[PDB]
């Protein structure tokens, strides 16, 4: 019954894991020094929680999953495995090798069925098999009732969900990052608890952000370019870096998963949908979607996010390829730090004073008999940018206290125009909600195409030879 995770025994992330999963008990057991250990521990516990609340003897659709992970599970899985990625061949070869080595040593795991399923598919690519297929989400023609997504950011959420509901699916799950920073139209950000940094294509040559690179120079007073520019706005291309692995993503598909509370799917058949958040821990969320046939209720087109920790978004100045520009950066702040800062933001503080006080509140020296250790609450490299945000916030709130307006009227006079004030910092305190306007009515989903066999003969021969032995 104990659940074992690959976390160091002295890590401070263990306490956060326990409060997020109070129905389990977690014991650390480290076997490898992976650079993204925290990002994998959460995913492991999420799968265990889902399987505990799913009715048994029911088939499950797993979209875009490596089949080597669902081998020892006692449930029924149908893996959809297209071959449009650069690391698919390794996963397929590893799955075949592990399957062959497991034959004859495991009593009841349906190993023989899996072996027969793989051989049948390799003979005819277009065949359909209960445990394996090479179609896409909109091409698979196998009926089920539960669908599971895991770290998928390459599909359109309304279009993909509609095709699943046609086959008769009434439940779905999603595991991944938090979409809220991308709804604010930010340029760069970071998730410090999981050692993840993301940035835009146009700021990859910055100097003082999480993910950048530059070089030394002397500085010249003249240089000409054919691009006038004069406009720095976010684009559709975004780079992700989790640990030491790179992932290219797109903004349009990321924002499509910020579903509203209630929405309708209208087409040949009609459905009514909902969306809830069950687990949230410092950036990772788990979502549950229910689908029913018919058309009921009314829609409002609003999305609500609940903040347990502080959320910051400020404006910074940096040099990109030698030129000084300005953009926006977002991050997360622990709740304990935010509560202890309430006293000093009642006055005006310079950035230097804020930085010094934050350092004192963060670092402590701990002695255990004769050993000495230094302990930190949050990562140190984000302190300078955070200190700037508090200084600006404390100044904007004061100005509202002298220019007091009348109650119930709008000031609009020499000309009938109203002045718009400047804003440089958005700060969301703990126990505060944010609301956004999105779309709730979806009509067109027609995306016809032709299916092409994504496989090669050299790969087919290698798999067949590997799956050739008397057991």
């Amino acid at each position: 019954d104990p659940v074992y995770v690959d976390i160091d025994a002295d890590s401070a992330f263990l306490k956060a894991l326990q409060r997020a999963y109070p129905m389990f008990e977690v014991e650390p057991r480290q076997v490898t020094p992976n650079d993204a250990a925290n990002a994998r521990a959460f995913s492991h516990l999420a799968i265990k929680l889902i399987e505990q609340e799913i009715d048994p003897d029911s088939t499950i659709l797993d979209i875009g999953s490596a089949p080597a992970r669902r081998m020892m599970s006692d449930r029924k899985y149908h893996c959809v495995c297209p071959m449009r990625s650069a690391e698919d061949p390794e996963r397929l070869a590893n799955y075949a090798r592990k399957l062959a080595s497991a034959a004859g040593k495991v009593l009841d795991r349906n190993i023989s069925g899996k072996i027969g399923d793989l051989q049948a598919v390799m003979a005819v690519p277009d065949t359909e098999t209960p445990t394996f297929c090479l179609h896409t989400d909109v091409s698979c023609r196998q009926r089920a009732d539960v669908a599971i997504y895991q770290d998928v950011y390459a599909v359109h959420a309304p279009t993909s969900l509609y095709h699943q509901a046609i086959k008769g699916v009434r439940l779905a799950y999603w595991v991944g990052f938090d979409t809220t920073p991308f709804m604010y139209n930010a340029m760069a950000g970071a998730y410090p608890s999981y050692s993840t940094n993301w940035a835009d294509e146009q700021v990859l040559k910055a100097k003082n952000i999480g993910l950048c690179s530059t070089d030394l120079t002397e500085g010249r007073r003249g240089k000409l370019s054919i691009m006038r520019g004069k406009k720095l706005e976010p684009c559709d291309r975004v780079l992700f870096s989790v640990g030491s692995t790179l992932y290219p993503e797109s903004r349009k598909l990321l924002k499509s998963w910020h579903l509203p509370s209630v929405f309708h799917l209208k087409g040949k058949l009609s459905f009514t949908c909902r969306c809830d958040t069950v687990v949230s821990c410092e950036g990772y969320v788990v979502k549950r979607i229910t689908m029913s046939p018919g058309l009921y209720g009314k829609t409002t087109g609003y999305a609500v996010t609940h903040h347990a920790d502080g959320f910051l978004m400020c404006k910074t100045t940096d040099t990109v390829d030698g030129e000084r520009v300005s953009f926006s950066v977002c991050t997360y702040v622990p709740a304990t730090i935010c509560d202890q800062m309430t006293g000093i933001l009642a006055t005006e503080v310079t950035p230097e004073d804020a930085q010094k006080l934050l350092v004192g509140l963060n670092q402590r020296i701990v002695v255990n008999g004769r050993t000495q250790r230094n302990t930190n609450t949050m990562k140190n490299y984000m302190i300078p940018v955070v200190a700037q945000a508090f200084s600006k916030w404390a100044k904007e709130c004061r100005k509202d206290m002298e220019d007091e307006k009348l109650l119930g009227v709008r000031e609009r006079t020499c000309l009938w125009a109203f002045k718009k004030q400047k804003t440089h910092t958005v700060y969301k305190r703990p126990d505060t909600q944010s609301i956004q306007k999105v779309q709730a009515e979806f009509d067109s989903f027609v995306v016809p195409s032709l299916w092409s066999s994504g496989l090669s003969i050299p790969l087919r021969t290698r798999i067949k030879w590997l799956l050739s032995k008397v057991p």
């Binding site: 202890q340 006293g343 004073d353 010094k356 006080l357 004192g360 509140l361 020296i365 002695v367 000495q372």
Partner: protein, 611 residues
């Protein structure tokens, strides 16, 4: 010292903080005192100095020193702040504290009685001494040739781990001028700075070795802190204090330096050119100082044996300036964890002490007074561990603890004039800036462990230095058995009864008034009486601060309803009769400048003048 010295400066303050205008006790909140930040200005000094030359009657000079001292204070802050860059920190939110206040005291009227002829006052005092102390009144028959007699006989000493140069041991007296006293009390003159006196002072042998930091030592310390926290403290502050450390802060240094006086600031400024960093200053190196005054008590003991020589061990001047900003916070935290019926003399005045014990002591009540001076704290290493454990619980930051600990181990002392080297082991009494605090903590711990739960159920307990008084406690065999684990003379205890055997506390008497019916504390008259028979060194012009101190002390003695009680208290302590006449004699002496001149005489010069 504590209440008041001979010049009326004392150690306590003069501002009341424990006074209320209601007939009941009211709990209040402890606040902070804001300090004016010093600022630098050179143009003002230049113009004021030139304007000083053209005209300066009396106040023009004073503006120059105020401007000059203010410039020095700003310079010290700028230099001192740069040294401790690795230890400086910022201000964190503070933990609030609360304190109890008491109503104002009530006093009886005073009537002044004095004689007229100052010569008759001397005769009465001399008659009093001869009748009660026959041997003391016949010692003086010639001049003061104590220095010559000390040179004729050799040098006797009992040293341990010391080196000295035998070629510099020579003690021929130098010139000595003084005024012949009129009172026949034979109070000796301060000793001369010679190598013979230094060796005589360091005739103490405390060579004892035990377990330094082993398991048996830790077990004894662990029990001691358990008794202190269980029988003398409440449990509402420990967890909050541990979370918030105490660190060196700019406000601590700014507040500290601003409180220094003129000459003290100038002396500190002269040692800021070659400023060593905080981590470079040694914490286990001391210097030896001799300039003191001999201590004499009533009785006949200084006319038969020579008194001892007092010494001072001075630490590094920079060591006591970097870290002396944390004393105020330590006092506040200690007062917060103590029980309401347990009191400490820190951060009080004379009036506040009277208001606290106004309605607690009544005639026929047993009071236990105990001192711990006669105890060898160097024998056991657990006495130092207990203090550190208490300090750690109070919330002292970890690297600072290492600096403090370095001064409680092996130390060395040196005498600059003669190049004499001394080495000492574990020592508690020193010249560092935590001496009263550690002694007070150990005094409370010893009493708590011995008395067990009898300390909790009490009316009033006061602890300061090496003296304490506890109300409603008698002497039984249980405390003797508990204290006889190692030996028997650890502490000295005395039983006192109000209005029968007056208790003694900090060189004073606790008496219960008759007209009003309240307790009060007064000074010791016999201690003053012997002090007027001390010769005055030539060239001293401090004969005006003493008259004011005597005038204040005389007025407190002549309060109605305390004359009879004072007579019985002195007789029950020293077995002497006839002190009302002495008090009257003191009254006429402190009435005018010329009346104070009758205590001196012609100038006598010895060992000087080639004629």
């Amino acid at each position: 010292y504590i209440f008041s010295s001979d010049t009326g400066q004392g150690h306590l303050q003069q501002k009341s903080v424990r006074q209320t205008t209601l007939p009941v006790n009211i709990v209040e909140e402890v606040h902070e005192e804001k300090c004016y930040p010093p600022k630098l200005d050179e143009i003002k000094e230049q113009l004021l100095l030139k304007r000083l030359q053209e005209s300066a009657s009396t106040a023009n000079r004073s503006r120059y020193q105020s401007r000059k001292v203010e410039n020095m204070k700003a310079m010290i802050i700028h230099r001192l702040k740069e040294g401790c860059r690795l230890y400086l920190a910022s201000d964190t939110p503070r933990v609030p504290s609360y304190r109890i206040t008491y109503p104002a005291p009530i006093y009886s009227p005073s009537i002044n009685i004095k004689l007229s002829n100052p010569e008759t006052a001397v005769a009465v005092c001399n008659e009093f001494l001869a009748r009660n102390y026959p041997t003391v009144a016949s010692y003086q028959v010639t001049d003061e040739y104590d220095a010559y007699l000390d040179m004729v006989d050799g040098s006797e000493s009992c040293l341990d781990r010391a080196t000295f140069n035998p070629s510099k041991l020579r003690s021929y007296p130098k010139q000595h001028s003084y005024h012949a006293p009129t009172i026949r009390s034979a109070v000796p003159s301060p000793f001369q700075n010679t190598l013979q006196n230094v060796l005589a002072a360091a005739t103490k042998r405390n060579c004892n070795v035990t377990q330094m930091r082993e398991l048996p030592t830790m077990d004894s310390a662990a029990f001691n802190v358990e008794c202190f926290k269980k029988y003398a403290c409440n449990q509402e502050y420990w967890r909050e204090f541990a979370s918030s450390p105490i660190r060196v802060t700019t406000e601590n240094l700014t507040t500290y330096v601003t409180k220094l006086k003129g000459p003290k600031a100038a002396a500190l400024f002269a040692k800021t050119h070659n400023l060593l960093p905080l981590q470079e200053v040694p914490m286990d190196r001391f210097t030896m100082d001799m300039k003191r005054d001999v201590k004499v008590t009533p009785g006949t003991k200084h006319t038969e044996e020579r008194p001892k020589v007092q010494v001072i061990q001075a630490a590094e001047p920079l060591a006591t300036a970097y870290l002396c900003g944390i004393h105020r916070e330590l006092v506040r935290r200690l007062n917060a964890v103590l029980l309401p019926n347990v009191h400490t003399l820190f951060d009080m005045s004379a009036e506040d002490f009277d208001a606290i014990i106004a309605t607690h002591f009544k005639p026929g009540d047993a009071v236990l007074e105990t001192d711990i001076a006669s105890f060898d704290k160097s024998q056991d290493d657990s006495l130092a561990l207990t203090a550190m454990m208490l300090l750690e619980d109070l919330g002292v930051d970890q690297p600072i603890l290492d600096l403090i600990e370095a001064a409680f181990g092996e130390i060395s002392s040196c005498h600059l004039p003669t190049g004499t080297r001394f080495k000492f082991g574990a020592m508690m009494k020193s010249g560092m800036f935590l001496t009263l605090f550690v002694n007070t903590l150990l005094n409370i711990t010893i009493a708590s462990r011995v008395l067990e739960e009898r300390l909790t159920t009490s009316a009033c307990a006061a602890f300061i230095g090496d003296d304490n008084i506890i109300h409603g406690v008698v002497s039984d065999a249980l405390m003797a058995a508990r204290c006889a684990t190692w030996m028997n003379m650890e502490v000295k205890i005395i039983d006192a009864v109000v209005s029968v055997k007056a208790p003694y506390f900090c060189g004073g008497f606790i008496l219960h008034d008759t007209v009003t019916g309240t307790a009060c504390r007064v000074a010791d008259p016999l201690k003053r009486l012997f002090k007027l028979g001390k010769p005055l060194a030539a060239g001293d012009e401090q004969d005006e601060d003493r008259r004011r101190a005597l005038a204040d002390e005389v007025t407190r003695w002549q309060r109605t309803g305390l004359v009879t009680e004072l007579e019985r208290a002195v007789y029950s302590r020293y077995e002497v009769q006839g002190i009302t006449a002495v008090i009257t004699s003191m009254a006429t002496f402190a009435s005018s400048k010329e009346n104070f001149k009758k205590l001196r005489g012609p100038v006598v010069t010895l060992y000087g003048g080639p004629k």
